[PDB]
Amino acid sequence: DWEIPDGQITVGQRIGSGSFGTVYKGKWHGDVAVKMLPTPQQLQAFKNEVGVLRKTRHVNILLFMGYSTKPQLAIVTQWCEGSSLYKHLHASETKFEMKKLIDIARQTARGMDYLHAKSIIHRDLKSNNIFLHEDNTVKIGDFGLATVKSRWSGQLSGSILWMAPEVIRPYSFQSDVYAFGIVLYELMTGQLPYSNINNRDQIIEMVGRGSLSPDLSKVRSNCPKRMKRLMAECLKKKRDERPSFPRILAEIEELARE
């Protein structure tokens, strides 16, 4: 039983607010993050999200701690101190060492490898959803508040660059692998893909039809050969030609030691 009774969680500072939820910093036997989401759609979506998080016990996956029903639906997770991968590469524009870049990728592949072993498809893997908690441990969660956390979907502008061709035209282990390849492109170039394109509808049409893919010539000079090859396999147009996370993780782990 993970239900936290009414009056234990001290809800504090509002961290973020979206169209389908408000996240708050809080106290409950230490620091926590509380997601406040009642209609039957919200009730099914709350229980689906608690059911998926309930299945995760991994260091590289955001620690679910509990949930509440009264006086409002709430999901309690650990507090993540620091910034997302998107904030480090694109806002702080920090230049991590190659060792630190390969370690973030290794930690992300461990979390994704664990998720796919537990039959969990992320569906929204992106640098925004990869937290560099305490600047050392990588925490994969779903910190987005603009979409509903349901089994399947029927305003996705902050996720288009990580969508595979079949996801634009769907959700599988291979579509997460594509998104991870995009994350690898961000680590290896320091930039988001398709920066020269001026419209979102041009990326949607060109990526979807297979005539558009990240430019691997824009990668850092010190980027390893195995990393260039790994990104290329994860970003393949045909999803069946994409590697699985065990093979991705073992390539990053063999690269990290070399």
Ligand X SMILES: Cc1cc(F)c(NC(=O)c2cccc(C(C)(C)C#N)c2)cc1-c1cnc2c(=O)n(C)ncc2c1
Residue 29: name its binding partner from a second copy, ligand X, none (Cβ under 5 to 8 Å by kind).
a second copy
Residue closer to a second copy, measured from CB, 65 or 89: 65
Instruction: Give me the 30-69 binding string for a second copy, x by CB under 8 A, dash otherwise.
Output: xx-------------------------xxxx--xxxx---
CA distance 245 to 242: 10
Residue closer to a second copy, measured from CB, 113 or 176: 113
Residue closer to a second copy, measured from CB, 112 or 161: 112
| Smallest separation (angstroms) from ligand X to the CB of 118 | 9
CA distance 39 to 119: 28
> Of the residues 124, 135, 142, 201, which is catalytic?
124
Task: Name the one residue in this structure whose structure tokens are 């389908």.
Answer: 20
Residue closer to a second copy, measured from CB, 233 or 253: 253
Q: Is 17 helix (H, G, I), strand (E, B) or coil?
A: strand
Task: Name the one residue in this structure whose structure tokens are 């070399």.
Answer: 258
| Smallest separation (angstroms) from ligand X to the CB of 115 | 6
Catalytic status, residue 124: yes
Of the candidates 26, 89, 109, 142, which one interacts with ligand X according to CB under 6 A? Answer: 142
Residue 105: name its binding partner from a second copy, ligand X, none (Cβ under 5 to 8 Å by kind).
none
Residue 68: name its binding partner from a second copy, ligand X, none (Cβ under 5 to 8 Å by kind).
none
Told to check if 86 binds ligand X by CB under 6 A, we report no
DSSP label at residue 181: H
Binding residues among 91-150 for a second copy as defined by CB under 8 A: 107, 110, 113-114, 117, 134, 136-137
Which residues of the shown chain bind ligand X in the complex (CB under 6 A)? Answer: 15-16, 23, 33-35, 49, 52-53, 56, 61-62, 75, 77, 79-80, 115, 120, 122, 140-143, 149
